[model samples]
Target: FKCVNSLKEDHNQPLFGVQFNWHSKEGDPLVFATVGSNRVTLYECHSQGEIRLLQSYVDADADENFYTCAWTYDSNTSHPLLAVAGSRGIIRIINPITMQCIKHYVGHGNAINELKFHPRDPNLLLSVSKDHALRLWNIQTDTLVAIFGGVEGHRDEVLSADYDLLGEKIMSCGMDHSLKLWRINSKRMMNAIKESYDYNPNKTNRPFISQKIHFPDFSTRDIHRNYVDCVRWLGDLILSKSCENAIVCWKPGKMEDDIDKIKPSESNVTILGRFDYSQCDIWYMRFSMDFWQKMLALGNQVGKLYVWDLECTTLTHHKCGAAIRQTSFSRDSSILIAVCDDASIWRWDR
Candidate 1:
């Protein structure tokens, strides 16, 4: 249900960390990873159940590029990679197969913490960092599409973000106690209601609305027991978890009363209900489209792999030896790619 930590004294350096993305066509598997240094390794999975290391791109220094992530197929360019964000506040475009880095983005003033390819549209990639800003990247032209700021929502670093199934909008969470909503300029300009955050919930004597967004006195603050570490959405409802191990489910568009109060589970949100490993930090999580089935793929700090049935009500667990750095599921939903500290790509099949 979870995997191992990177930067260990152990010799399993190549499996240091892993990230995966799949092409739209069936049987195309492009797995990516970053070892102890910023050396990015590529592994390609073929239709005949074979995995091969394709390329390696080394970084100049940890400061010039503190490369933390690599995502696949964004910007509608038909190329596999969308954007790459580094510690020096530099965001770039990359080729998954060639390992060529493009220094095209000039957004964040601080180091970029994480980057994501748009789930539906390849041209749109999302980025957030210590500067407390969220930006969208247009890969074709390599430009900043939009910025989500102006409201004093998050105080510091944004940890992770994800788009819902439709990809019309997105959810972002960070070290800041807040979770913010993002939409295209046309959607925001067309919206009918403006949220009012000045009213007091207690003085107005109204409970938090989960039905409609009725802004009351900014009385009670966004009650996050810990920093918002990761964010994902199930339809219009949002899921947010903290580094301190707290989970909150919210319908951001709901009236003050409509949203669900934050829930605290030591093992709150893992891949799916069938397989769950509790009390471990959530290393990485992604959804899967297995045609007729609904599933989630999860990697944890313990190095275990778990594929869970989201339609079910119980927890099922899968175990793999050694700590798992990152995981990716193939396009056919038949193979799984996990890179370990061993510096090799491990492919799994059902």
Candidate 2:
């Protein structure tokens, strides 16, 4: 990977999150979103690593700090919608073309740490917050489909959550030092809730029909010694990190009838391998994998971007300025973007 370009606008505020649009088509201009301080900005990457800022939206309250963002498309309009959330706990769905906020969602009690869209469905969204819960939302209808937390949920702030490639399962990690997996009953539970709402329209007493506390199928607090800030699905397996020096690649054990019968052991969470030299001891420094799952990239505290070729078993690093906060790979797997504490955005091309 070669360092192609770096951009630092007038604003000197550190960037916290960055993500490439997953729906970008082949041979099209690459698009991405970044959140920092109180603003969300959109940019387009052109040939020769030329990145142009398309639009930006700043929060009404300047004190609000945006943490994470995700991209999804409106099924009916076929336009990309950007989800931005942060310290205020409210999610704003923005139309990147017009830079207009189409919807505002309120449910999480505290700061939202991360947001994810379902792999297949554009309407479905998953959010994990510092409120110690994970909530699934149907963004099209502005309805809460399910809440995944209660007595069996994280004891502390939840940091990250993601949907698997097939959207059949979910993995979440948090400051409680726990990693939990939940089975998504998309065919049964989601359909039942939709049918109930359609048949009984006057059930306004329960605005959210699916308000039951959906517990995880498996939970263990022995994965990371410190806060587990980032987690993602690598196909059916898992890739996650704490404030540790490496990224652990592992998989959960088979589902059991009784979750209590499960214990924290190697058999429960099988370790596949660990990618060393990450140096991601700072919390909230996220890592990303390419769409093909062939390469993994992450930023470290020492202002370096690390890329690992899973098939080749080789690692490479590129120098940037200041502490790198988050790294992302383009949908085509040809470009890598890293946001840093120096209030700059760095790009690398293969």
Candidate 3:
């Protein structure tokens, strides 16, 4: 990979997250979003590696700092939708073309650490927060479908979470030094909520009884040495990181026969392998996997970008100028972008 382009924020505030629009189809221009300090900016990556800023929207609340963002498509309109959230725990669903906030959701009591849109269902959005819970929301109907935390959830702030390739399972890790796997057992309930929303779209302040509480199928704190800040699903296996010097690959064991009989203490986690040589001791530094799942990339506190070629079993590192908070891969896996604590975005072309 070679450095191709860079963009610096005018305000010089640190950026925490960057992600490409994985929903983009072939023959379309690749696009991505970067969020920091009350602002969310979109950029387009040309085929030849030129990255240009498309538009930026600043939150009205000056104190709100946007930490993370995700891209999805509207089920009906098929238009791209961007979901961004952070310090205020308020989520803003933005229309990329018009650069307008189409909807706002407020429920979490603390800062939101990450957001993920369901792979297949555009209406489902997942969020994890410092409030110690993971929330699943129906963005289309403006309904809170489920909350995945209580006495059995993360004891500390929940930092990162991702849905599996099939969208049937969710993997999450956080400040509590635990990694958890959740099975989506409420598919029927979700479909029912969508149907109800369509029937009464104009029902002002409609009360929803579908708000459910969810418990994880498997949970364990034995994987990481410290807080597990970032986690991703590679098929059924898990790739996760703590501030501990490496990324671990692991898998969950078989589920119990009775779902209600499961306990966090009875977790069955198997370690597969570790990608060593990372110096990420700080929190909120996220790693990203390319769409092809052939490569994994992450940034560290010392401005170094680490890339692990999964197919070739090779590890490469590049030095940028300042501390990097997060990294992302373009849809086609042709471009890799890194957001830095220096408030600049760096692009590397393959």
Decreasing TM-score order of the candidates: 3, 2, 1
> Once superposed on the true structure, which residue ranges of model 3 sit more than 4 Å away at CA?
186-206, 254-265, 312-319
Candidate 3, lDDT over the whole model: 0.83
lDDT of 2 by residue, 255-302 (tens): 432323444342466677898874568887887888898988787787
How well does candidate 1 match the true structure in TM-score terms? 0.68
Give the alpha carbon lDDT tens digit for every residue of 1-350 in model 3. 88877778896999998989888788887899999889999999976668888999989999999999999898877889999999999999999998999999999999999999888888888999999999888887777877888868888999999998878778889988988877774576557556546644466565764544556778888889798989998877789999887899987654323333444456566788998865688777788889989899877788778888888132233546677888899877888899988898888888
Enumerate residue pairs that collide in model 3.
none
Which of the two candidates, 1 or 3, achieves a greater TM-score against the reference?
3
Model 1, which residues run further than 4 Å from truth?
A: 1-17, 27-36, 46-49, 62-77, 185-224, 244-249, 253-276, 282-293, 312-325, 340-345
- Model 2: lowest-lDDT 10 consecutive positions: 257-266
